[PDB]
Design a protein around this ligand. Structure first.
Ligand SMILES: [Zn+2]
Length: 425
């Protein structure tokens, strides 16, 4: 309570200092004395304080004789050093229940006013307490606004016990290949950019694996055109085992786990003349050689599906084509307007599996067209008519590639066609 010891609230910054009490950099400090009820100052920190405060200090302690609760005392001789006063508390002797509660109510007993505290860690001695409990009791009791605080050790292993108690164990990956377990400070946790699969996480649950979103992660996602939710899905789907198989001139993705929407899209694509942009052609040349894993996982993450779930083959072929060099120019049949078109044609009305069309804004009709450049075009829509070239048919929640002439990788019933490829010749 001495008025010269008061400092107005400030965010607490604890410091754990090495050597003995005489060493400390004081500042009108409250020096804590871990004592017995008779203030004999027998040994430990308590005798080191007693032979610092002087003999008149020790006589006044004998006057007041047995102490039941904490006692505040002037600092006597130690005032020269910057000690405003001395606070006496009786640690529990670490051999009784419950010692860590009494440890906690000992530090609570100490840290009550906004002052600079210097504290020998409680429970030293062979009659003492586990120092990890003491350091833990202290963080449980330390208020958040009580500025600079100094603990005092002389054990040189306690700087680790301290560092560990203020770190949380986090499992992280950039990969879903190698997983790394880290001990992070509440600062390191936010520097880690821990990602849940949905959102960033500033208190990780134990045992759970988090994506550490480095800048290499961000660049990889963007090379693949995925946000981070998608990128996580992508990394995990790379672990699915698939079988691919040369059949009908193309590498086919064996039916499994509702993946037909993928095989149908990739098989149409294989019967066009398009070339993927560099990042994606790298996945694709793996698939074409027997490593379907990355390319297929990219398909699922780009179209927001999970393996086992069944998706849209138009989604797939449109994803593939837009990541390629697909483009053509032409003139309309309705008014001979020149135009350019990249990606698939989405023929929303008047879809004709043997006559591809575009929408003319001028005449407000779905018109055929005469190509001036490019190699072909993919059209998507739905009609019951039959195609005469590479197409995709969808019926009864199954979908499959068919070249124009029966030539099928699935059934040969009546089915809507949902995508067709039209070469220009
Ligand atoms: Zn027109």
């Amino acid at each position: 309570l001495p008025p010269e010891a008061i400092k107005q609230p400030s965010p607490t910054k604890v410091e754990l200092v090495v050597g003995e009490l005489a060493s400390i950099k004081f500042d009108n400090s409250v020096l804590v004395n871990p004592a017995n009820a008779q203030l004999t100052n027998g040994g430990g920190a308590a005798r080191a304080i007693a032979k610092l405060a002087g003999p008149k200090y020790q006589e006044y302690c004998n006057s007041v004789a047995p102490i039941s609760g904490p006692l505040t005392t002037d600092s006597f001789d130690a005032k020269k050093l910057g000690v405003a006063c001395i606070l006496h508390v009786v640690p529990p002797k670490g051999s009784d229940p419950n010692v860590q509660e009494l440890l906690y109510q000992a530090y609570k007993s100490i840290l009550t006013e906004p002052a600079h505290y210097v504290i020998p860690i409680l429970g030293a001695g062979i009659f003492g307490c586990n120092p990890v409990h003491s350091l833990d009791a202290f963080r449980k009791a330390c208020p958040s606004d009580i500025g600079r605080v100094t603990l005092v050790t002389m054990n040189k292993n306690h700087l680790q016990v301290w560092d560990a108690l203020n770190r949380t164990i986090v499992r992280t990956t950039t990969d879903y290949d190698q997983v790394t377990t880290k001990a992070l400070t509440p600062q390191g946790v936010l520097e880690a950019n821990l990602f849940d699969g949905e959102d960033f996480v500033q208190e990780p649950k134990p045992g759970q694996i988090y994506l550490e979103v480095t800048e290499e992660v961000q660049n990889q996602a963007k090379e693949l055109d995925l946000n981070l939710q998608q990128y996580c899905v992508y990394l995990k789907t790379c672990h699915h085992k698939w079988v691919v198989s040369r059949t009908n001139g193309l590498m086919h993705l064996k039916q499994k786990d509702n993946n037909c929407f993928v095989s149908a899209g990739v098989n149409l694509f294989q019967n066009t003349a398009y070339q993927f942009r560099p990042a994606i052609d790298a996945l694709y040349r793996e698939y074409l050689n027997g490593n379907p894993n990355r390319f297929v996982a990219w398909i699922y993450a780009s179209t927001n599906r999970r393996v086992g779930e069944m998706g849209c083959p138009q989604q797939v072929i449109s994803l593939l084509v837009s990541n390629s060099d697909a483009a053509f120019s032409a003139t309309t049949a309705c008014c001979n307007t020149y135009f350019n078109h990249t990606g698939v044609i989405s023929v929303a009305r008047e879809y004709d599996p043997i006559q591809p069309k575009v929408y003319c804004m001028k005449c407000d009709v779905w018109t055929p067209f005469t190509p001036q450049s490019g190699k072909g075009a993919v059209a998507i829509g739905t009609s019951a008519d039959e195609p005469t070239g590479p197409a995709i048919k969808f019926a009864a929640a199954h979908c499959w590639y068919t070249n124009g002439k029966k030539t099928v990788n699935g059934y040969d019933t009546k089915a809507n066609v949902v995508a067709t490829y039209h070469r220009f010749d």
